[PDB]
Structures are given as C-alpha cells and as structure tokens.
Subunit: 240 residues, 3 copies
C-alpha cells in the first residue's frame, strides 16, 4: 500500500533539488576561484580533476531530486522513476562520495573503499525489491561490506586526523560526524522502515532520506570544500 | 503506433554498423602505426591509452548498430533491444566521446564535462519513456546540463584553438563544426519528433540519428585521428 | 522449462560464495602484508591501488554468489535475481579481471582490452535473452570481439613471458592456462547449452559456471597474487 501525499513529497524533493544542486554550483564556483581563501589561480592554472568531484556529486544528487520531484508530482510510479527502486540512485552517488572523501585526505585503498560502498548499496537495492524473508539476507550481506568499511575508514581517518593543523582539523571533525554519524543511519532506518519493523511509514522514509541527502552530499560537500581550502591554505599558500 | 519498414531500418543500421565499426578499426590501425604521418613507433613503444578511445567509440557504436539491426530485422521489440529505450545507447558513448575530445585538446574539467554529458543523456532517456507532460520537464532538465556544457566547451575550445598551427587548426575547426553544429541537433530533433511537435515520424527519427551517429562518432573520430597525427607531427616530430 | 534442484544449486552457490569471497580476503590480506615473500611495507607505505583489484574481484564475485544462492534458495526467480539474466553478473567482473591481468604484466592497450571483454559479455547477455534465430547473431557478434581479443592477448603475453625469470615464469604459465584455456570455454558451453545444441541442461549449466568462476576469478586471482609477490621479489627485493 503506497497512497501518500505526493504533492508534499514532490515539494520536498523539489526544495531539496534546488538546495543540493545550488550547493553544488557554489562548490564548483568556489573551487575555480582560488587556491585557498585567496584568489590564487593555482600553479598550473586549474584545479586537479578530483577537487571538482564534491561539487558534481551535489549536482548529480540535485538532478536526481529533480527527477524524484517529477515522479511524485506525476502522482505515482513514473516509467523513469528514481523512487520505485530504493537505493538505486545512491549507487551512482555514494561510491563517488566516499571517493571524494578518500581523495581529499589521500586515504589509501581508494579502490577498495569504492567497491565497499558500491556493493553495500547494491545489497540495499536487492533487499528492498525482495518480498520475502531473504530481504534481510541481502541486508546482512550489505552490512558485511559496510561494517569492515566503516571500521577501516575510522582507523585511516584518525591516522590523517592528528597530522592536520587545528584550524584545518575543525572541518575534518564535522566531516567525520556526517560520515560516521549519518551513513550508518541508513541501515538503521531500513530496519525500522515498513520493509522491516514497520515503525517508519513509506512517506516518512522519503522525507528522512531527503534531509539525509542534504547532509551527506550537500552539507558534507561544503565541509569538504571548506576543508580543502584550509588544507591548501596552510601548505601551498603559507609553505608549512 | 510503431509499424514501420523494419527491413529498411535494419538495412540502414546494418550499413551504419559496417562503416562506423570499420571506421573504428582504421583509427586503431592508424593509431598504432606511427607517431604522426611517419612510422615512428613512439618514444615508449606504444601510444597513450587515451588515444585509442576515439577508435573504441566507433567500435562500441558499431557494435550497438549491429544490435540495432538485429532488433529491426527481428521485426519489432527484441528482448535485448537497443532501440526501445531511446538515448540509452548514447549514455555509454557520448560521455566517452566528449572525454576523447577533452583529452585530445587537454581541456580542463574533464570530469565535469563527462558528468555534464552523462547526465544530459539520462534526462533524454527519462524524457522519452515518460508518457505525460513531464516529458519536457526532463527535456528542460537535460538542457540545463547541456547549455552550460556547450557554452563552457566553446570558451575552452577557442582558448586552445588560437595556439595550434594553421595546418593543425584546419582539423580542429571541422571537429568543432560537428561538436557545436550536430550535438545540439539531437535536442532539436526531440522537440519536432513524434514525442514533441510531431513533424518527424518515428521511422524518420531512426534514420536521421543513423546519419548523426555516422557524423558525431565515425567522421568526428576520423577528424580527431587526423588532428592528433598533425598535432604530434608538429611538436614531437619537428620539435616545434 | 526451468524446474531444477534449487537447494542443490543454492548450496553450490553458497559453497562457492564462501571460497571465492574467502579467497579474495586472503589476497587482500596477503597484499597488505609485504612487498614480496618478506614483510617489507613497501617504499611508500602502501601497495598501488591496482594490486588490490585481484582481491576485490573475488569479493565482488563472492558477493554475487551470495546473491545467487539467495535466488536459488528462494525457489525460483527472485526480483533481484543474478541468475535470470545470464552473463549480466560477468559484465562487472570480467572487464576488471582482464584489467587486473593487464596491470600485472603492464600489457599495452588496457583500455582496448577492457572494452573488448566488456562488449564481449554484453553480446552474451543479449544472446541469452533473445528467443529467436538472432541469438546466434549476438553470439557471433560477441565472438568477433573475443577472437581478436584472445589472439592479441596471446601475442602480448608471450612478449612479456620470455622476459621474466624462470621462478616467476612458473606462475605466469598457469595464469595463461586459465585465461587461454577456460575463458574460451564459456562460448563453447553456450553452443552446447540448452540455448544452442541442447546437450547441457540449464541446471548443469549453472554448476559448470560455478566451477569456472572458482577458476577464472578465485584460483586465477591466487596465481596473480603469487605471481605479483615473485615479480616484486626479484626486482624490488633483490635489485635485479
Ligand atoms: C534524470 C537524471 C538521472 C541521473 C542518473 C540515472 C541513473 C539511474 C537509472 C534509473 C532507472 C529508472 C527505472 C525506474 C523504473 C520504474 C518502474 C515503475 O514505475 O513501475 C511501476 C509502474 C506501475 O504503476 P501504475 O501503473 O501507476 O500502478 C497503479 C495502477 N494505476 O509501472 C509502470 O509504469 C511501467 C514501467 C514502464 C517501463 C519502465 C521503463 C524504465 C526506464 C528505462 C530506462 C532506464 C534504463 C536502465 C538500464 C537497463 C535497461 C532496463
Ligand atoms: C550488444 C552490444 C551492446 C553494448 C552495450 C549495451 C549496454 C546497453 C544495455 C541495453 C539494455 C536493453 C534493454 C532493452 C529492453 C527491451 C524491452 C522490449 O523490447 O519490450 C517490448 C516488448 C513488447 O513487444 P512485443 O511483445 O513484440 O509487442 C507486440 C505484440 N506482439 O516486450 C518484450 O519483448 C518483453 C521484454 C523481455 C525482458 C527484457 C529483457 C532485457 C534484457 C536484460 C539485459 C539487460 C540488463 C540491464 C541491466 C539492469 C537489469 C534490468
Ligand atoms: C547483491 C550484490 C550484487 C552486486 C552487483 C549487482 C549488479 C547487477 C545488477 C543485477 C540486476 C538484477 C535484475 C534481475 C531481474 C529478475 C527478473 C525476474 O526474476 O523475473 C522473473 C519473475 C517471474 O517468476 P515467478 O513469478 O516466480 O514465475 C513463476 C510463476 N509463479 O518475475 C518477477 O519476479 C518480477 C520481477 C520484479 C521486478 C524486477 C526488479 C529487478 C530489481 C531492480 C534493481 C536493479 C536495477 C537495474 C538498473 C536498471 C533499472 C531496471
Ligand atoms: C551501474 C552503476 C555504476 C555507478 C558507479 C559509480 C562509480 C564512479 C566511477 C568513477 C568516477 C570518476 C572518478 C575517477 C577518479 C578521477 C581520476 C583521478 O583520480 O585523477 C587522475 C588525473 C587527475 O589529473 P592530475 O594527474 O592531477 O593532472 C595534473 C596535470 N599534469 O586525471 C586527469 O588527468 C584528468 C582526467 C581524469 C578522468 C576524467 C573523468 C573520467 C571519470 C569516469 C567517470 C565514470 C562514471 C561512471 C558512471 C557515473 C554514475 C554516477
Ligand atoms: C550506466 C551507464 C554508465 C556508462 C558511462 C560511460 C563512462 C565511461 C567511464 C570511463 C571511460 C574510460 C576512460 C578513462 C580515462 C583513461 C585513463 C587515462 O586518462 O589515462 C591514465 C593512464 C594513461 O597512461 P599514461 O600515464 O600516459 O602511461 C604512460 C606510461 N608511463 O592510464 C594508464 O596508465 C592506462 C590504464 C588506464 C585505465 C584502463 C582503462 C579502464 C577504463 C574503465 C572503463 C569504464 C567503462 C564503464 C562502462 C563503459 C560503457 C560504455
Ligand atoms: C553497466 C556495467 C558497467 C560495468 C563495467 C566495469 C568496468 C570497471 C571500470 C573501472 C574499474 C576500476 C579500475 C580502474 C584503474 C584504477 C586506477 C589506476 O590504474 O591507478 C592510477 C592511480 C594509482 O596510483 P599510483 O599513481 O600508483 O599512486 C602512487 C602514489 N604516488 O590511481 C590512484 O592514485 C588511486 C585512485 C584510483 C581511482 C580509485 C578507484 C576508482 C575506480 C572506479 C571504479 C568504477 C567501477 C564501475 C562499476 C563497477 C562494477 C563492477
Ligand atoms: C541544523 C541547521 C542546519 C541548516 C542547514 C544548512 C544550510 C546551509 C548553510 C551552511 C551549512 C554548512 C556550513 C559549514 C561551515 C562553513 C561556514 C563558514 O563559515 O565557512 C567559511 C567560508 O566558507 C564558506 O563560505 C562556506 C559557507 C558557504 C555555504 C553556502 C550555502 C550553500 C549554497 C546554497 C546556495 C543556493 C541554494 C538555493 C536556495 C535554497 C532554496 C531552498 C569558513 O571560514 P570561517 O570558519 O567563517 O572563518 C572565517 C575566516 N576564514
Ligand atoms: C558530405 C559527404 C559525406 C561523406 C561521408 C564520409 C565517408 C568517409 C570519408 C572520409 C570522411 C572524413 C575525412 C576527413 C578528412 C581527412 C581526409 C584526409 O585527407 O586525410 C589525410 C590523411 O588522413 C587520412 O587518411 C584520413 C582519411 C581516411 C578515412 C578512411 C575512411 C573511413 C574508413 C572506413 C573503412 C571501412 C568502411 C567499410 C565500407 C563501407 C560500407 C558501407 C590528412 O591529410 P590531407 O589534408 O590529405 O594532407 C595530405 C598530406 N598529409
Ligand atoms: C584440481 C584441484 C583443484 C583444487 C581447488 C583449489 C583450492 C585452493 C588451493 C590453492 C589453489 C591455487 C594455488 C596456486 C599455487 C600457489 C600455492 C603455493 O605454493 O604458493 C606459495 C605461497 O603462496 C601461497 O601461500 C598461495 C597459496 C594460498 C592459497 C590459499 C587458499 C585460498 C584461500 C581460501 C581460504 C578461505 C576459504 C573458505 C573455506 C572453503 C569452504 C568451502 C608460492 O610458493 P611455493 O611455490 O610454495 O614456494 C615456496 C617458497 N616460496
Ligand atoms: C551523535 C551523532 C550525530 C554522531 C555519532 C558519532 C560521533 C560521536 C563520532 C563521529 C566522528 C567521530 C570522531 C572521528 C575522529 C576523531 C579523531 C580521534 O583522534 C578522536 C575522536 C574523534 C574526534 C571522533 C569522536 C567521535 C565522533 C565525533
Ligand atoms: C551550419 C552548422 C553545421 C554549424 C553551425 C555552427 C558553426 C557555424 C560553428 C561550429 C564551430 C564554430 C567555430 C568554433 C571555433 C572557432 C574559433 C574562433 O576563434 C573563431 C570562430 C570559430 C571558427 C567558430 C565559428 C562558428 C562555428 C564554425
Ligand atoms: C566470427 C568468427 C570469429 C567465428 C566465431 C563465430 C562462430 C564460432 C559462430 C558463428 C555462428 C555460430 C553458429 C550459429 C548457429 C548454430 C546453431 C546451434 O543450434 C548450434 C551452434 C551453431 C552451429 C553456431 C556455432 C558457432 C558459430 C559457427
Ligand atoms: C587443456 C586446456 C586446459 C588448456 C589449453 C590451452 C593451453 C594448452 C595453452 C594455454 C596457455 C598457453 C601457453 C601460453 C604462453 C606460452 C609462452 C610461449 O613462449 C610458449 C607457449 C606457452 C607456454 C603456451 C603453451 C600453450 C598453453 C599452455
Ligand atoms: C547520500 C547518501 C549516502 C551517503 C548513503 C549511504 C548509504 C549507506 C551506507 C547504506 C547502507 C546499507 C547497509 C549498511 C546495509 C543494507 C542496505 C543499506 C543500503 C541501507
Ligand atoms: C553520437 C551521439 C551523440 C554525440 C549524441 C549527443 C546527444 C546529445 C547532446 C543530446 C542532448 C539532449 C538534450 C540537450 C536535452 C534533451 C535530451 C537530449 C538527449 C535529446
Ligand atoms: C569469471 C568469468 C569469466 C572470466 C568469464 C568469461 C567469459 C567470456 C570470455 C565469454 C564469452 C562469450 C563469447 C566469446 C561469445 C558469446 C557470449 C559469451 C558471453 C559466452
Ligand atoms: Na562511513
Ligand atoms: Na557540444
Ligand atoms: Na583470454
């Protein structure tokens, strides 16, 4: 049974489309404006190709929420629906989201992290579309990819966390709060959603993920953008 | 209503399969034959991995037209149809097509261009399969990704256009004619097709795109191949 | 007609899931344990990102066999089925499998090989789902991508085969046995399967591919892992 207030859901996706997409434009605008807090046009005249990955993720997520809003405003399951198959839209975004984080701190094993998150979400896509007791077999399989990934990421994050200056360490701390505080919120919501326990309705499931996407991609991207400016402002602008 | 002359459409796709695929084989054959117009086997003994991207695109496009011809010769919607979902086959080709162009001129923001064209086509895939007034919402969303992408590409193209010698500038000019003259022809055909205004029938839509693919991938790849030979013939063969 | 012993098929996939996935964990564990047979933590403190590709392939394949086992244990076609569309799961694995092999021997034209195997499998996906005489048109199209790919790979393999020391040449020989002895076994099984000649039943088709995947990904990955240790033990551990 899925008979929910679509105009409300479409409005929320439309509002999130503007902010997430608009947030991405600022990141790209701010990236190609100066090496750090100054207006230095880099040594080579352009930023490295990976620094723009944070901005593109929000634009990619913002575009998806534009399509989600069209799906809800239509009033049901559109033929090109980005809401019917849960977590399918996140397959194209989360692997890049961890990849952007990995490049920012030059964490090791970027390829391992990419497939860790790439396969974590595909287990979510399979779990959602499975109307049987094996829904949680995929969920358990997905967690087997996430738990080693989360724990290993914490270990490497702390390795890089104590080497940054305190001024630049402030932004990394809040990036970790979003990464290690909200990413594990998606599996928790899956357990309690209508798929699992049943406490959270389908409509409330969409709204909560709308705000989670505002946090994990838009706000997280802003912190990465601000972190990157400070990181380059201490090394390549001050020589330290 | 889709009851069109499939043997004609299959023949056209079959003919385009041979030329596009055959054109790709020449590019690969010509690439691994000499640094420029001579038979110099490069300094490292092999061409860089990206120079072969132009040839692979035609082979990838040629393979797709082999599958399209099988779909039409079958006489309708084959289970593995590359014609039922319009613009879906272009999702795997156009992003590489811009990527090959970006590497040829070492344009900045290659990652931004890739996702600009990657998301431009996905809006086309959604627009086609949407039997409602929101077809043009996806179309408008797709154009929001294409118009900044086209205009920005023109700005960077002209930046690199005035630094090449006139001999090598001739080939770049015609590459721009195809890129800035025919890529915007796809959205124009969408408006006038049976999806939009209704002037162009579905059958004529397939035929026109068959010739557009001959131009944007096969002929465009040839110009890139000839451009690349001249570009390397002026710098690494003459020292200028 | 597909009414086969699913508990047997689920058990085989479950057993292959444990070994293939478990084999991948050893590769990753062994990779990040020493430059060669010693415990040298590399010069830069971490292995290159591509050395871990062999381990990830088995984990990716092992995860897929976890999903295949869930599909069979369910007792038919699960909504998220990795068995309904034959060769679709191999699209994400084989291109990386050749890519891992190409990086191990630093073979040229890695991009050409990737699309050669990527498009070879997509022809298999189309061939399987085509209930007409054009099934073998896709099969023939797929072989047109595989035969040049196989023959070219043999030529480049032998080029790199005579330059390695005999101690390290032993492992390369068996890698070639799997690559040039079992990869062409998949098209042969397609001809004789229920899709083609009809000698091999659908159930026996799953079991044989279960053992082929144990060989082409798990055992092949082990040989690559052992080969890589020896290759680095002769150059960067002995200076030769
Ligand atoms: C736009 C920017 C996007 C950027 C990145 C995109 C990448 C992600 C790709 C998204 C894939 C979209 C698939 C969504 C399928 C939705 C199916 C659906 O809605 O089904 C339910 C719905 C039933 O609902 P009603 O009939 O209203 O029931 C009430 C009774 N009156 O069924 C339908 O409408 C039938 C669906 C028609 C066919 C679906 C076509 C999907 C579009 C195909 C293009 C996508 C290509 C995917 C690649 C593999 C090829 C399948
Ligand atoms: C070969 C080289 C290709 C290289 C790169 C390929 C990448 C692009 C992938 C292409 C995806 C292909 C999807 C096409 C689906 C076509 C559906 C279709 O034709 O439906 C219409 C047709 C109705 O027509 P008729 O019955 O003739 O009506 C007249 C009444 N007598 O419906 C059918 O035939 C039923 C369709 C059967 C199921 C479709 C199976 C599609 C193949 C699956 C493999 C693709 C995997 C995609 C990944 C996501 C998983 C879905
Ligand atoms: C888990 C780790 C995986 C890692 C990597 C994954 C990448 C590969 C992606 C795999 C795509 C999976 C597609 C499988 C579709 C299977 C369709 C199927 O089983 O149909 C047959 C079956 C008929 O059988 P029964 O009714 O039992 O008949 C007997 C009568 N009692 O039909 C059904 O069950 C209906 C199918 C429901 C819809 C299918 C939904 C597929 C899941 C969608 C997510 C995948 C996204 C793909 C991207 C493009 C969007 C389509
Ligand atoms: C079926 C679902 C599949 C969805 C999975 C999504 C996973 C996304 C896959 C990869 C995302 C792309 C990011 C890859 C890393 C970017 C390359 C990198 O690290 O930089 C190397 C280097 C950076 O330059 P430097 O050496 O600093 O230059 C200094 C000048 N002397 O590269 C360059 O030179 C620039 C060119 C890099 C490649 C251009 C971008 C191509 C990326 C491919 C995107 C693939 C996306 C697949 C689908 C997306 C769906 C969301
Ligand atoms: C769901 C729909 C998804 C479809 C989206 C399609 C987007 C395509 C994604 C990426 C396409 C691949 C091109 C990426 C750029 C290639 C790498 C590059 O720029 O070169 C770096 C560098 C080049 O060498 P140099 O440093 O010059 O060596 C000198 C020797 N001392 O790399 C190398 O060393 C060679 C190895 C490069 C990687 C090999 C190719 C792997 C590419 C992955 C393809 C991904 C395709 C995804 C699906 C395709 C569908 C059409
Ligand atoms: C629709 C079906 C599509 C499925 C097709 C599957 C094809 C898979 C596409 C690409 C697979 C990823 C492998 C690409 C090659 C990896 C990059 C590489 O060669 O290394 C370059 C270089 C290695 O470092 P060095 O320069 O040695 O550093 C020394 C320190 N001074 O790169 C790095 O620095 C590390 C970062 C590399 C990128 C991180 C990984 C991102 C890869 C994208 C994966 C895309 C997968 C797409 C879907 C997968 C489905 C199975
Ligand atoms: C619990 C309430 C949640 C509210 C939601 C948040 C909404 C967005 C607001 C920003 C959230 C993230 C901010 C992270 C912290 C950075 C702010 C900051 O101060 O940054 C500066 C500089 O960096 C910045 O400018 C970052 C802030 C810019 C954020 C811009 C907002 C996002 C862009 C959206 C525009 C388009 C949206 C469309 C309208 C919305 C319609 C619904 C860094 O230096 P300071 O510590 O000030 O030191 C001063 C000396 N250097
Ligand atoms: C409006 C009419 C459109 C006609 C369609 C076009 C069909 C293909 C013909 C070529 C079109 C693109 C040519 C672009 C310009 C390059 C031609 C050229 O002259 O190139 C040379 C050299 O480069 C070349 O050789 C490029 C031309 C080679 C093109 C080969 C054709 C494509 C391969 C197809 C073979 C297989 C097709 C199967 C048969 C078809 C069955 C239907 C560059 O130097 P020049 O200016 O001559 O200076 C001389 C001193 N250096
Ligand atoms: C026809 C029978 C087929 C049997 C199936 C094979 C099962 C797996 C057994 C290994 C097969 C591949 C082995 C390849 C050859 C390497 C073995 C070897 O000797 O390696 C050493 C060292 O390298 C190794 O250790 C490689 C072997 C390690 C393989 C570990 C097995 C795979 C991991 C699976 C664990 C988890 C599985 C879960 C349980 C299964 C439940 C069903 C290299 O040096 P040597 O020539 O011994 O010289 C000695 C002085 N240097
Ligand atoms: C309450 C919700 C939102 C967040 C729950 C997770 C919080 C408590 C987690 C997420 C990120 C974590 C931080 C990540 C990194 C470090 C650096 C280390 O050297 C000290 C601990 C410290 C500072 C962690 C403290 C705990 C932390 C803040
Ligand atoms: C009529 C159709 C096919 C093409 C329409 C677009 C044509 C007119 C466009 C496409 C590419 C464009 C060229 C692209 C780059 C340059 C370099 C610049 O320094 C002068 C203008 C010039 C030379 C442009 C002239 C206009 C041009 C030729
Ligand atoms: C293109 C070049 C490299 C040859 C590779 C394709 C060859 C091996 C393919 C092309 C067409 C194929 C044949 C087409 C149809 C059938 C009917 C089937 O009931 C049995 C197999 C059989 C007889 C196939 C065997 C393999 C075959 C001959
Ligand atoms: C019987 C099945 C399993 C395998 C059939 C293919 C076998 C015979 C093939 C696969 C790999 C091949 C080897 C690959 C590379 C070389 C190096 C070359 O300098 C001499 C031949 C030699 C040693 C080949 C001999 C034949 C070989 C072993
Ligand atoms: C912007 C969205 C982000 C960063 C989403 C992240 C989502 C996850 C890490 C989801 C993980 C899941 C599991 C751990 C197991 C079950 C399936 C999921 C998808 C809910
Ligand atoms: C070989 C084929 C090529 C280069 C195709 C390019 C296609 C486009 C740039 C299509 C663009 C579209 C829009 C701008 C908006 C609406 C949807 C499209 C797909 C028609
Ligand atoms: C682990 C699995 C591997 C390495 C599988 C490899 C499969 C192939 C090389 C399959 C090739 C095919 C053809 C040559 C043509 C017809 C279709 C295939 C898929 C059976
Ligand atoms: Na995390
Ligand atoms: Na353009
Ligand atoms: Na092979």
């Amino acid at each position: 049974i899925n008979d929910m207030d679509y105009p409300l859901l479409g409005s929320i996706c439309a509002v999130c489309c503007v902010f997430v997409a608009g947030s991405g434009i600022w990141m790209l605008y701010r990236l190609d404006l100066g090496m750090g807090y100054s207006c230095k046009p880099y040594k080579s005249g352009r930023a490295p190709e990976v620094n723009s990955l944070s901005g593109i993720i929000c634009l990619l997520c913002g575009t998806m929420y534009a399509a989600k809003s069209f799906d809800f405003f239509d009033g049901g399951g559109t033929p090109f629906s980005l809401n019917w198959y849960w977590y399918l839209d996140y397959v194209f975004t989360c692997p890049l989201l961890i990849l952007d984080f990995a490049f920012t701190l030059d964490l090791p094993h970027k390829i391992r992290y990419f497939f860790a998150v790439f396969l974590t979400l595909w287990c979510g896509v399979a779990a959602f579309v499975t109307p049987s007791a094996y829904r949680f077999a995929y969920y358990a399989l997905g967690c087997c990819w996430f738990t080693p990934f989360a724990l290993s990421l914490m270990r490497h994050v702390k390795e890089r966390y104590l080497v940054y200056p305190p001024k630049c360490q402030r932004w990394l701390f809040w990036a970790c709060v979003i990464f290690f505080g909200f990413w594990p919120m998606f599996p928790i919501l899956f357990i309690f959603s209508w798929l699992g326990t049943g406490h959270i309705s389908q409509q409330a499931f969409y709204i909560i993920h709308a705000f989670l996407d505002l946090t994990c991609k838009s706000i997280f991207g802003i912190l990465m953008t601000v972190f990157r400016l400070e990181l380059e402002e201490h090394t390549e602008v001050q020589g330290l």
